[PDB]
Write a protein that binds this ligand. Sequence first.
Ligand SMILES: NC(=O)c1ccc[n+]([C@@H]2O[C@H](COP(=O)([O-])OP(=O)(O)OC[C@H]3O[C@@H](n4cnc5c(N)ncnc54)[C@H](O)[C@@H]3O)[C@@H](O)[C@H]2O)c1
Ligand SMILES: NC(=O)c1ccc[n+]([C@@H]2O[C@H](COP(=O)([O-])OP(=O)(O)OC[C@H]3O[C@@H](n4cnc5c(N)ncnc54)[C@H](O)[C@@H]3O)[C@@H](O)[C@H]2O)c1
Ligand SMILES: NC(=O)c1ccc[n+]([C@@H]2O[C@H](COP(=O)([O-])OP(=O)(O)OC[C@H]3O[C@@H](n4cnc5c(N)ncnc54)[C@H](O)[C@@H]3O)[C@@H](O)[C@H]2O)c1
Ligand SMILES: NC(=O)c1ccc[n+]([C@@H]2O[C@H](COP(=O)([O-])OP(=O)(O)OC[C@H]3O[C@@H](n4cnc5c(N)ncnc54)[C@H](O)[C@@H]3O)[C@@H](O)[C@H]2O)c1
Lengths: 136, 352, 356, 332, 350
Amino acid sequence: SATFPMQCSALRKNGFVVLKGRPCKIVEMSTSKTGKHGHAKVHLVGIDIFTGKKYEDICPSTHNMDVPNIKRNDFQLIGIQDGYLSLLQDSGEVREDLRLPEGDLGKEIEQKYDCGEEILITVLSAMTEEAAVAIK
Amino acid sequence: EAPAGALAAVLKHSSTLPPESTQVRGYDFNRGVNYRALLEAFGTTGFQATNFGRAVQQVNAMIEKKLEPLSQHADLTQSRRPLTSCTIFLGYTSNLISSGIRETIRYLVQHNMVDVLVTTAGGVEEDLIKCLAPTYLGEFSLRGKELRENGINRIGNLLVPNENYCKFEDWLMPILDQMVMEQNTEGVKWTPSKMIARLGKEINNPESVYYWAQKNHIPVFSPALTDGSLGDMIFFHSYKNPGLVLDIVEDLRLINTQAIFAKCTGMIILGGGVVKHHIANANLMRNGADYAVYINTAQEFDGSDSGARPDEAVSWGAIRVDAQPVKVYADASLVFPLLVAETFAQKMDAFM
Amino acid sequence: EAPAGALAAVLKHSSTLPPESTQVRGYDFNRGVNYRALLEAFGTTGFQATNFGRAVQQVNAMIEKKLEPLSQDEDQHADLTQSRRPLTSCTIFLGYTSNLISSGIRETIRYLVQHNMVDVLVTTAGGVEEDLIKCLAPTYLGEFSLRGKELRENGINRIGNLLVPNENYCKFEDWLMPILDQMVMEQNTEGVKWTPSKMIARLGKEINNPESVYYWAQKNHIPVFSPALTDGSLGDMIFFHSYKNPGLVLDIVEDLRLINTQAIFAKCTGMIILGGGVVKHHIANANLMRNGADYAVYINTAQEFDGSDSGARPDEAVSWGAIRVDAQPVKVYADASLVFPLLVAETFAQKMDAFM
Amino acid sequence: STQVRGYDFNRGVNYRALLEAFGTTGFQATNFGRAVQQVNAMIEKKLEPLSQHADLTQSRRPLTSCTIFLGYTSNLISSGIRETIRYLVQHNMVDVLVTTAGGVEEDLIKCLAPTYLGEFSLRGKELRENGINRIGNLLVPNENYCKFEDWLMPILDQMVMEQNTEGVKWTPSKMIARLGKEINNPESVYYWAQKNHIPVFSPALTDGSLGDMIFFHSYKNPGLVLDIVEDLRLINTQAIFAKCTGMIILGGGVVKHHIANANLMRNGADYAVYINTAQEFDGSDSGARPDEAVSWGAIRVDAQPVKVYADASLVFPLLVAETFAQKMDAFM
Amino acid sequence: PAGALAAVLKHSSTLPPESTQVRGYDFNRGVNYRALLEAFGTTGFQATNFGRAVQQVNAMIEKKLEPLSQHADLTQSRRPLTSCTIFLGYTSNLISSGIRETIRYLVQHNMVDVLVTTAGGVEEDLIKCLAPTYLGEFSLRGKELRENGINRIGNLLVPNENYCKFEDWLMPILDQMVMEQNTEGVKWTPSKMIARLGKEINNPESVYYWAQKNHIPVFSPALTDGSLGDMIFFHSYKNPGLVLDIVEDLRLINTQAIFAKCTGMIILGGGVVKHHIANANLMRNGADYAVYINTAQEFDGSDSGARPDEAVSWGAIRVDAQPVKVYADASLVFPLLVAETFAQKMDAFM
Ligand SMILES: NC(=O)c1ccc[n+]([C@@H]2O[C@H](COP(=O)([O-])OP(=O)(O)OC[C@H]3O[C@@H](n4cnc5c(N)ncnc54)[C@H](O)[C@@H]3O)[C@@H](O)[C@H]2O)c1
Ligand SMILES: NC(=O)c1ccc[n+]([C@@H]2O[C@H](COP(=O)([O-])OP(=O)(O)OC[C@H]3O[C@@H](n4cnc5c(N)ncnc54)[C@H](O)[C@@H]3O)[C@@H](O)[C@H]2O)c1
Ligand SMILES: NC(=O)c1ccc[n+]([C@@H]2O[C@H](COP(=O)([O-])OP(=O)(O)OC[C@H]3O[C@@H](n4cnc5c(N)ncnc54)[C@H](O)[C@@H]3O)[C@@H](O)[C@H]2O)c1
Ligand SMILES: NC(=O)c1ccc[n+]([C@@H]2O[C@H](COP(=O)([O-])OP(=O)(O)OC[C@H]3O[C@@H](n4cnc5c(N)ncnc54)[C@H](O)[C@@H]3O)[C@@H](O)[C@H]2O)c1
């Protein structure tokens, strides 16, 4: 479903993994093999997909960790009504429960429409969180 | 005729030596094999056998001085061990624990024959590991590329499988978890000596050196405990439970206080390195030690402290001026069991 | 008439060596004294000069690898590493013993630290105190055969064939006590956790002498690591200071993390170790985390017949993963005093321009 | 497949078990145990009975099942090990002796005056004005060399007389046997060596006090000739006409290579034990490992040579007490 | 307690003003090779010994160049004598390496007087004129090299074919040496045989060709320990009768040292060469100068590891001398010693 086990010896770069309860993307991976330290160990460095914090952790080569399931969707945001974010959802209803990305980046989407630039708004679905970050 | 100068140079007249001088004499086997008499001829045989005999005499003097009854305790020191007529420091390297000499040092620790122990990080790791898996015999000429592919580590001519280090980790991680917790709740300040005592308590094996060391209240000091597999395993454990602190100043106070409040001191050092200098610096506080015996294979021509002769320690006050230290240039694995068989094993029932 | 069988042993038939075989040549002095050619001819002379030449080639390979520019697009993790030093294409560890600072090699090591030619420094407790003392009092020459009683009566300590008066250590205490007082005050009033590396970096800022190794080490942000810092004159000073202002704490677990992370996050690593002891095994243990080092050079006068670690050949470190399988480590069986200045005169000195 | 175990002193003090435990103790103790095994194999091979070439070999000594070469350096005769080597020569436990010049005369000089103990740190000047010579940590009065000249000169006169009147061709081995006969002391090595027909070889006999004595003597009664070509055929034919060979070398230098070259003529030796403190990093022959002699045919490719890195004065008495002393009866 | 403070801190005395400070070479001035080698004297442990050896050799060279103003009858030699006579001794393995080129430079230009070596050091030099020597490793296995017929000397490799070319060169010569013994009344000694072989080799790259061309005696007490002994043994089965006398060379080397104004010694290694030269110099109550370069230690009581001070005990070196020993491999320090001495004085040896 939204989260499934996987042996972290089989992970690769540019994957996804739950690091300290965060759906992070792996940017560095290494293995220390077996020797005087005791067992083969994996050193993982990951970057959060929502906030941008860096996390680091260490695996024993045989045990398992949770890989999250991410759903990719691009919604219809065409037209600004009443000054709000009138997301044209295909569910037949309209709601503003989705807020803008924190800071001035969220303002970058609405102000460019008056300049005649189209944006492919993408809403990212996580294992337990519903926030829109990815822009393309 | 032959020139007079050559004859005057080759053939001079000597001066007679005092009758106090001892003649060179060996041991003849026409009288049979008497092992006690064979080992006493070493004193009058030759170059290093004489040094071995003098070492035997020095250690015997240490032992005889120790057993004299004591006439106070200065218990302000963090020590539960009483005071005797002579305090003995025993220092050794790490490669001597991986060999059979481990069974000799333990004999001295089980019977309260020494007072202070000094070693390095490997000398604890290997001693604890040997209670979980054994060590084998190899050769000096084995190639490392083929050894690594089969997961075997080499130490001199000894072989250690990789799996021996897999068990140790499994035995160590639960203990470390119990050591951080006591650091947060009970406010326990950890030092290397306390950690070594805790590990010796936990191993619970009568064949281990540190089990008897903690059972008999014999302090063990090691200034650099993070240089080895123990430090490697501590490094990986801190990723899950951070916040471990090991302090090295209280250990310095404890070891320097042992020499200051001692009636008499003696040193037995096997090898060189940090264990030799650390004990010498500890004994410098009381203006030097009274007896000293060195056994190491280093040479002095490179200016190293390991290869230093016993005469330098007199120059900077580590050994008293009116003492006669002895050094033997030999491998410890060949001369330590023979030294113990003539000094400590003979006076065995007097240590009860 | 000689026995036939005995004639089959002395005159045994041989094989033919491969064409890629180097012959043996010396330097011909009939052409004059050309020092560069004289030093290059060591590679084919014989027993130890061949090892010297191979060490020169290994260090040159290290230097060529280091100078390669990075893509400068990498993440270059600085928060996970806790380092202010930018990353290069090759990280170099330099390890040395205490007695090498009491000699003139101190003016050879500093030249490498002043010009950002190394990355990590590893030494012992004596190698710091002697360097700091040399900035206050000088050191004299002597003899290997000198009686200890007469030296002790006059208060002169001997290190090999070097002499050090006691007044050199009396000047150290006066300079050192206020720094310790400030350190203890900051430990409580500002919440500072002290480690041996931080303490070493602190003492180099106070000597304020451009002739000091650890002044340039702290000026260029080069970490210096020393596990057993309490084995020397500085340890006695701390012991005596603890009776007036107790509370100083040095932690050795953080330095292990720092030195290990210096090797985990490295593109390539090389080792140069002069002597043996704890520094050699410390650097090897640090390099074990990344499955070994790519280049290595050893210079010491220790033999392996007693199963020691100092006398271990470079092929033993391959067995437990300290050095990589496909590497070519070199060891020179010689005194560092005679060899290190000649090694630096050929590498790190012909490329002075490229390091600016 | 052999574990590492020390000796447990809780069983008491048993010297035989303590010496046996060295085989599994560690670094050089293992080498000592292997050397004990090699020497025991030599001894058991020698005692086997055979089931004729005295003319070809120029040797009146009878043949056995294993010929043993014993080589030693000069400074080991000034020590107490002299009293051990003699024990092997008195009971016919070896076959060939190889030494240097200084290792010969110090055995004769010890029959006239003793040697005393000293220290390694004695200054040379005061020793020179007092007429004391230092060898390591041993002291020899110069007066001991004044006793040697008086005893030696008439022997040289007789040798010169017999060279001219009787047509005697002198070689170092013949001279050593002649000197051993004349001392007539049962505590001397070379008295027992000549009494039991054991050849002693010394390629360079003029490097010592014998050379000085001959040089001074030649100014009055000249004509002494010492040939070395004849002395080489004897040692080569000893190795050529042997059923089995074994080597025991204490130290290095001329004697080591001289024994190895002789054993090369039979395509190598079958057993070999080395005891010296030299290192091989400088390319010297003295410090060469036993695997280097296999390369040029001095040792057979299927043998198991052993080297011990220790002082001989500490190891040789323990080695003899474990191998030769336990087979005393079989050598009667 | 104040007693501990009385141990760590003690009052000291002032050193004499004639004390040299420790200082290395500063690389901020660039690489100046002449000044880099001069800074070894005040650098440390063995570099100081190197500097002292340089000074000793320079003193020998300066003493030799002082003009004289002599009895050949007693010495039985043709070489004229100078203000200083120099003995040069070396071991066998130093000729198998590149140091063989440095010795020939001194022999070619009459910079030394007497040569002392072993049997291998004579045959290796002549073999090198027929076939070369290659480079190997210290850890090559024995039986693998034996199957391919390669002999190992340290980290050097020698094919056996080299010894098959040597024998072919040697057998015709030996025959002649027998004939002259039975017809012309020739009395052979090792030095005369070495001179004859050096004359026969006729190669300007050989040490002994220049030694015989300049009338430099070479001594070797044990000439039968090596390949020459093997060839002589195999040759004596069909042409018996060869005799080598060692007493006459003992006379010659001793008379070379008795009738000398001043003596100097340079020895590379140990063994019989060191004792032989020292015993030769004992007959004049010692030598004025001495420099040692070897890697032996003294804890085993050996003569090779003996310090220069022990030679003073039995009169091998004068009491008022300053002998020097350098603890290093000769292959690394001999070319550097010749770069500073014997080479800056080239113009004075024409
Ligand atoms: N197996 C190992 O050697 C091992 C294992 C883990 C960690 N280490 C680490 O190695 C470092 C160096 O340890 P060290 O200083 O104890 O050893 P070392 O080998 O570095 O130095 C030992 C000293 O004693 C001498 N010596 C060694 N073996 C001897 C013997 N059998 N008889 C006589 N003298 C002998 C040496 O020549 C030298 O002077 C330490 O940091 C230690 O924790 C070593
Ligand atoms: N002046 C001093 O030596 C001095 C001063 C204060 C404290 N100490 C203490 O002494 C202890 C031992 O010091 P260490 O472990 O650094 O080394 P060390 O003196 O124990 O020497 C270790 C090994 O380094 C090698 N070595 C030493 N000098 C060499 C040289 N010139 N060339 C080549 N190889 C050489 C040898 O193999 C030697 O056995 C340390 O605890 C240190 O703090 C020493
Ligand atoms: N290639 C060979 O070595 C070779 C070949 C044929 C015969 N031999 C025979 O081998 C015998 C033994 O040789 P040896 O007595 O001439 O010497 P050796 O090989 O016994 O060496 C003696 C000593 O010289 C010193 N030494 C050696 N190499 C050195 C170096 N590179 N730098 C500094 N010091 C060094 C050391 O102190 C060493 O212990 C001789 O009788 C010789 O004829 C040798
Ligand atoms: N007292 C004397 O030594 C003495 C006296 C007169 C003449 N000489 C002359 O000196 C010459 C050169 O000396 P040498 O080659 O006979 O002996 P040496 O002592 O010079 O031989 C040195 C070699 O033997 C080894 N060695 C020596 N003693 C050892 C010991 N106790 N334990 C282990 N290894 C040991 C050394 O490590 C080295 O390999 C000889 O030709 C001899 O006649 C010596």
